[PDB]
Design a protein around this ligand. Sequence first.
Ligand SMILES: *[C@@H]1O[C@H](CO)[C@@H](O)[C@H](O)[C@H]1NC(C)=O
Lengths: 50, 33
Amino acid sequence: RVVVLSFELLHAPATVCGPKKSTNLVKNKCVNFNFNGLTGTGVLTESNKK
Amino acid sequence: AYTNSFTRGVYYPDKVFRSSVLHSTQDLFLPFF
Ligand SMILES: *[C@@H]1O[C@H](CO)[C@@H](O)[C@H](O)[C@H]1NC(C)=O
């Protein structure tokens, strides 16, 4: 019995995420962020993009 | 009857937000005119 799990890696709103719990968001400080599995480090600020 | 496709048949190639940039993509689109 074989099941192949095909993954569409992220390009649209995510709906199937692992058991990792979310945290609160802190703005205007240098942080190590992880948004829907996309990781990086930087300062998160409000924006006027749409 | 036939007509001229007047600047039509272009779609957003992906779901990534881009602005103030010219992005080149190759895929199946309807050619202009
Ligand atoms: C459709 O294309 C052919 C060849 O390019 C052209 O001769 C014909 O006139 C076109 N149709 C119309 C309505 O112009």
